[PDB]
DNA sequence: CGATCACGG
DNA sequence: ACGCCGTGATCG
């Protein structure tokens with residue numbers, strides 16, 4: 267169609283109205299220190315394209331960007347706010363984010379550009395980003411006339427789409443979810459990303475050297491026990507060595523061949539001691555490629571900071587994800603890998619890392635939603651839920667529960683409600699299927715409210731076509747009412763899990779908002795560095811630690827009010843490792 | 847490029 | 856058929 271706009275040479279007053287759609291275009295997927303390629307503004311007065319050299323050097327435009335009373339509608343304002351922070355420019359007054367609006371309406375659409383959001387409301391006057399920029403190796407900023415139209419069309423779409431999106435969100439009881447939760451969170455995340463996390467690169471390099479030496483050792487020992495050289499990192503080549511050369515029993519097959527999973531290898535340990543060396547090599551290899559080589563590749567060598575990106579509009583359940591680097595999967599469960607955490611350090615001298623974590627938040631959320639008398643009682647009385655379950659499924663008194671029995675009970679606790687089978691429980695814990703089935707019966711008899719939640723939540727999903735979380739986030743499950751046992755089954759387990767995992771996401775998000783408010787309120791230097799699903803990581807001057815110790819846990823625990831209390835553990839020290 | 851494997855929640 | 860949600864390295 268025909269859409270008129272001003273390809274402007276200079277900023278003018280009518281471009282600085284107090285309500286506008288604004289596009290600050292960053293074409294690099296990773297927007298940290300990335301170029302801004304163009305600016306579009308659409309308001310009551312018209313449509314404008316501005317060259318970034320010009321607009322970002324203009325004191326009036328920069329003031330307008332920074333003024334919170336001048337309201338902007340955008341798509342992915344976090345991308346813009348961060349790219350602008352790298353250029354030394356503050357962005358304020360973002361009142362609508364089309365990306366977050368589309369995400370809330372349906373995460374399954376995987377909306378990742380203005381065009382994809384526009385399609386939800388049959389708005390077609392805008393091209394997909396991939397069509398304008400090209401895919402893969404063809405990725406390129408087009409000629410200025412083409413770029414300018416594309417950006418103005420994006421700004422025009424946001425301008426037209428705000429009301430229809432807000433109208434549907436309001437209808438879904440998700441309007442406060444957008445304006446009071448996700449949008450404020452976006453600003454908090456932008457600050458966390460830009461600040462970054464400081465890394466001890468010398469320590470990482472030292473670990474890397476040693477690891478390469480252990481790797482070399484374990485590798486040769488594997489070749490020696492196998493009587494051949496092969497690529498150990500090739501599950502397929504490893505399959506041949508284990509199941510053809512060594513004639514080890516084939517315990518599991520996939521559509522592609524023999525499994526060499528950690529679980530299969532565990533079950534093969536009575537047969538040959540090689541499998542235990544292979545497990546060791548894989549643990550070492552992971553630390554090396556992922557957490558040494560990977561981290562050092564992205565660290566900024568002049569500041570020693572890593573700058574992750576929290577994807578706020580990706581997961582189906584309302585969790586965040588973290589990329590380039592992922593800081594939500596740094597090792598903790600085994601002591602060797604946990605030491606990577608010593609390389610995560612305060613950004614200034616005399617600062618400390620502070621870490622706080624919800625205790626068993628998903629099971630507390632389950633207690634609340636299911637209204638199981640027995641489960642609710644456990645949390646109100648501050649009992650250990652994993653020990654209690656152990657007592658119920660092993661039919662023993664409390665003192666008889668072993669640390670191993672607690673671990674098995676933890677697997678039961680995080681498995682049954684989400685649809686684990688007796689088979690799955692038997693395979694995962696390497697125990698008899700008959701006993702696994704008894705565990706499952708005893709659990710349900712001990713927590714009958716949980717059995718009824720599973721039945722009721724699946725019924726609700728079938729009747730409504732979606733499930734909802736505590737703060738009204740939705741996930742649609744069109745696959746749920748199918749005759750196809752597998753497709754229906756996978757959808758049923760999503761119905762069981764999403765309300766629990768998604769409600770836990772809602773609670774921590776609200777917690778981050780409340781916390782930001784107070785830190786700023788009491789004018790502390792403390793700020794957030796990271797969120798890890800049910801944990802918050804901060805850094806602060808050491809003097810601030812007696813305050814954080816009282817403030818952080820309280821904000822966290824009172825974020826929402828449930829039919830059971832929420833519990834938070836917290837720790838500080840001179841590295842992330844030490845914050846335990 | 848989709849599976850496999852390992853790491854976290 | 857066989858708990859859920861993620862990212863990265865690596866393979867063929």
Ligand SMILES: Cc1cn([C@H]2CC[C@@H](COP(=O)(O)OP(=O)(O)OP(=O)(O)O)O2)c(=O)[nH]c1=O
Pocket residue numbers: 624625626627628652676677680800855
């Ligand atoms: C280990 C593991 C964990 N999870 C999720 C669900 C919980 C969170 C946090 O794990 P944690 O051991 O702290 O659990 P928590 O209940 O906090 O137990 P602790 O009191 O920390 O022992 O991770 C899981 O889904 N499957 C697993 O096998």
Ligand SMILES: OC[C@H]1O[C@@](CO)(O[C@H]2O[C@H](CO)[C@@H](O)[C@H](O)[C@H]2O)[C@@H](O)[C@@H]1O
Pocket residue numbers: 295296297342345377378379575577578579580589
């Ligand atoms: O800016 C993050 C935001 O952008 C999207 C696309 O709209 O994802 C892009 O950026 C991510 C972070 O660099 C990449 O991981 C992703 O591959 C890229 O498409 C959204 O998905 C995201 O919320």
Ligand SMILES: [Mg+2]
Pocket residue numbers: 624625626
């Ligand atoms: Mg825990």
